[model samples]
Target: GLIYAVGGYDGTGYNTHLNSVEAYDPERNEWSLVAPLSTRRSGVGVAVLNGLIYAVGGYDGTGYNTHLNSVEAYDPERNEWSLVAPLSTRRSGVGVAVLNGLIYAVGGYDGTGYNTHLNSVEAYDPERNEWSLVAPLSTRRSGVGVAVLNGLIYAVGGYDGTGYNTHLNSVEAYDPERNEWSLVAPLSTRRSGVGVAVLNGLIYAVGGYDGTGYNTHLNSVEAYDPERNEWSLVAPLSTRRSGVGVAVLNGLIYAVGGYDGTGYNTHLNSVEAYDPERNEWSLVAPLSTRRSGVGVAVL
Candidate 1:
């Protein structure tokens, strides 16, 4: 399996959005550039289906008003990216996950300001190349951490609206059969830009921004056990990472690039992997470039 880090923003040249894509070969422990996206994107959502990587909604500029609804699919075999059906609503910091052969794009910020934050949810059918609205979340969430467990889609903590005080601690689960969302065990602390992945039947919610405005990124991690219907603190990350990309590969959860808030322009290139059995995190190979809001997937 290979890990792909897709388009994101580098805190350089006035917050430049990136179009470049890179793939990490676990066997060789190397990172190599693949085909880049046609449009630069930051806060993108990504997922793999049928060997093709789908890049979903995200902003393409330094401003908030530049949110995008367009989507593109990357074909590794041809090393190319082609436009696919676009979403009905623009989304940045969107949560994406694949379930029941459908790609779901969850809550995100549609544009600048308070009411712009979305509660709407949408799912895509690759075969139809079309996206349709689904049940809306009870509360708005941008930068939500989404993952699938036991045929249910979980949407974790994220920024609802307003400022730091609005970052959420709430969690929700969607039942495809019921076409509805219901509250679940909330996080111990409010978080946005969190990384989520499932390992050993536990949904791990990794490092994220506590939304204290500046330099408030968190290194703490937590695991949610559906069976127990609760969340428990887990080993923390080595460093704080907000807007980080996360994916599970061969039993380990990889936390990729994001802003660590080490400094004013601290988008990170560093990476870390979590060992479930040992309950620890260890540094792994870093990304070729500093990237925050990067979308990650295993292909």
Candidate 2:
């Protein structure tokens, strides 16, 4: 399996949005340039369906809040990105998870501003290249962390405008079979822009901002066990991050590029990995380009 990073900014202080793509091979410990996207985007939400990787709505870097509804797909066999149906709504800082072969775009800012956190959810049908509205989240939020486990889609901590807070600890789950969303155990610490992944039957929420007044970057990590309906602290990353990309392959959880420390305007090429079996995180080879809000997926 290979890990792919798609359509992020140019890693140049949020100046140049990017359409370029790259692929990382863990066995070779290297990344190679791949096909570029049709449109430049950042804070993009990506998910894999039936072996194809889909890149969804995100900011375009025209401005910090300027966003896109355009969506695209990458075909590994063809090594190309093709235009797909756009999102029903424009969004950035969104979370994406694939369930039952359909792509779901969860809570995110509606490109209006920070406070435009959205509760509305939508599902995309690849076969028809169409998008349809779905049950909305109970709470409005942005910069949410999303993952899938036991056939349920989980939306984790994010900014919900509660107390005008930028970080949130609330969690919710979606039952596709029932077409509904429900509250679940919240994260141990409030955060937004986290990277979440499912490994070994657990959902791991990675680094993000702590919702502090300064939006302090975080290296904290936590894991949720749906079976137990509880969350517990896990080994944190060696570096703090937000708007990070995450993926699982070969039994390891990989945390990719993101904004680290200086501010959301800053970027990091750093990559880290966590071995759940060992309960520890270790630095891995960094990306060639520093980035935040990048799309990650495994094939």
Candidate 3:
């Protein structure tokens, strides 16, 4: 299996929104570019369904006003990207998860400033090539971490308002059958730009920026057990990271490129993998370019 890093900020400049996608081969410990998206995106939500990678709503770097509603899909076999039905609403920093043949795009920011933080939810139907609205979240969120475990979709930490004080520690789970979202045990610390993945029936929330002094980039990690409805601390990452891209491959959780410092200038090229069996994290081959607001999926 290969891990794909989707469109994100490459730290080229404030105006840049990367359309580039890269794939990493764990077998070779090497990285290479695949077909780029048709539209540039940072803060994109990505997921895999039926062997195709879907890139959801994101920013196109026109500052706060460019939160996009566009959607696209990539076929690795063909090495190309094609437009799909877009979201009903613009959603930069959207949280995406797939369940029961549907791709759910959760809360995100639409660039209307503080009040624009979104609590709305939508789903994509590939069979119809269309997007439709779903139950909204109880709390508005952007940069929310999302993952699927058992049969529920989990929406983790994210920011709902402006500034560092807006970071959230709240967590919620969505039940498609009920078509509702309910609060779940929250994280140990408030976070935005957190990365989440499911491994061994547990949902893992990785590095993100906390609303603390200097807008602290967090290295702390946490895992939730739905069976227990509780969260537990896990082994921390070697370095602080925000806007990290996370995915589980071969029973290990991989944390990919993101910003490590308090400022945007510290976009990172580093990668690390955590082994749940050993409860340890180890460095891996880094990305060819620094990335933040990156989306990741395993194929």
Candidate 4:
């Protein structure tokens, strides 16, 4: 049994944030709706640790396209939400994960309409009810994906400061023990809005958009083996998409809801699953809504 929530952009041209939360059962191949979020938001960061699911900062779609600093925790056993301490700075496109009983909110966009990229990193200790600044990213970026491996945090591909929207191939690793960041090998291709997961001691960078004015959706998949300190391309995705959310469950990786880059900026309901052991991909249940910038958490 895993809790998988869906929160992302809606059908309208304007960003529509969802409050609905969905849970998935791998053994049964079924989905069930849990308690919904109090605020409607997309581009949210979600993490589950110590029996609690944390919903981090995201855009609320308001005046100047409001970026929320709010943090909400959902208790699966109780099916209730308790407000936690808010982020010190408001932002969107952030990546969140829990390590050592603390939630880390990583790099994202800061200004209205995404005018600026932020390199700031913050970690919150639930026990202390306080946030402390960590070492900033080596580069300023947004739309990045982060994962924890061997006590280190890896921040992968994202969009840099250019309005032209070039995909970044850079990978930066943070040593939580040392409170510092170090550069890792760059990705093979330039991409942004990627979904990252660490499996089998390797990091996999999944589907994202390449910097094409027409918005080129990609099925390209790259895996980085920290032991070798190198990257290798794997089986591509069945459906090309960007801004999708990814999660690993029962040794399988699930990629859900993104833009297909068709005419009129079409959003997608397609869901695809990948088997790292077999180096293969299979189409799975599609999302109920066709949207982008969604967040997924597995219980």
TM match of model 2 to true structure: 0.93
Off by over 4 Å in 2: 10-14, 63-65, 112-115, 161-165, 262-265
Model 1: residue 194 alpha-carbon error in angstroms: 0.6
Query: lDDT per residue, candidate 1, 1-299, as tens digits?
Result: 89999988898534688888999887787888888998888889999999999999998885434889999999999999999999989999999999999999999988743348888999999999989999998889999999999999999998987443488889999999989899988999888999899999999998888874443898889999999899999899888888999999989999998888753548888889999899989988888888888999999
Task: Please report the TM-score between candidate 3 and the true structure.
Answer: 0.94
How displaced is residue 147 in candidate 4, in Å?
0.4
lDDT of 3 at 102: 93
TM-score pick, better of 1 and 2: 1
Better of 2 and 3 by TM-score: 3
Off by over 4 Å in 3: 12-15, 62-65, 112-115, 162-165, 212-214, 263-265
For each candidate, what TM-score against the reference?
0.94, 0.93, 0.94, 0.92
108-191 per-residue lDDT for model 3 (tens digits): 898743348888899899999989898999898999999998889999999978443478999999999999899989988988
Alpha carbon lDDT of residue 176, candidate 3? Answer: 95
lDDT pick, better of 2 and 3: 3
Would you give me the overall lDDT of model 2?
A: 0.85
lDDT tens digits by residue: candidate 2, 81-177: 8988888788888899998879999978875544477888999998898999999998887788899999999999878764355578889999999
Candidate 4 per-residue C-alpha lDDT over 113-227 given as tens digits, one digit per residue, 9 for 90 to 100: 4467778899989877787888999887677888888888889888876543567888999988889999999888776778888788888888887774335777889999888
In candidate 1, stretches whose alpha carbon ends up further than 4 angstroms from where it belongs are: 12-14, 62-65, 112-115, 162-165, 212-215, 262-265
The C-alpha local distance difference test score for the whole of candidate 4 amounts to 0.78
Q: What TM-score does structure 4 among the candidates reach?
A: 0.92
